[PDB]
Amino acid sequence: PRRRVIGQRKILPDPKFGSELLAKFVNILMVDGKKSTAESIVYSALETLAQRSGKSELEAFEVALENVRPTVEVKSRRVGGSTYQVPVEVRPVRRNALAMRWIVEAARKRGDKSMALRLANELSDAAENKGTAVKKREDVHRMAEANKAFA
């Protein structure tokens, strides 16, 4: 869009728990058009979350979110002199976007026996700040703040 600013598509809230953020997490977790299995695995993993870290779904999910909530990020751009990444602020919507993306991509790996097991693994380890999600969060927090050439 050279002359447009196309707003974000409006999402429905997850009819099970009211959380639209989780409904978006489902799609971000969804692959191949299989939304039935996506909602199945996400609900199962939230159950496992509540029963593993005690705190219920709509709280452990958030604490797993902020604990990886990305602050800033570098982005490729050039205006003159040389090519270099530039640290830029990621919007709150883009913040929890990157959070959900990192979380689901992590949960897709470390697969041992089940989807909900590995998903709750990553969720809890993110909340406690020892997962790989938080390791990539730390890397993004180091990379961005390693260089702040210009504001």
List interacting residues with RNA (CB under 7 A): 1-2, 4-9, 11, 24, 27-38, 40-41, 91, 94, 97, 104, 107-108, 111-115
CB-based contact 111:39 (threshold 8 Å): no
- Scanning the structure block, which residue is given the tokens 């602020």? 89
Closest CB 4 distance from RNA, rounded Å: 6
> Whose Cβ is closer to RNA: residue 60's or residue 118's?
118
Give the residue with the Cβ less far from RNA, 11 or 146: 11
> What is the closest distance, in whole angstroms, from the C-beta atom of residue 91 to RNA in the complex?
7
For residue 2, the SS3 value is coil
Helices (H), 30-131: 35-53, 57-66, 92-108, 115-127
- Report the greatest alpha carbon distance in the chain: 55
Shorter beta-carbon distance to RNA: residue 33 or 54: 33
> Which value, to the nearest 10 degrees, does the dihedral of the CA atoms of residues 39, 52, 107, 127 take?
110
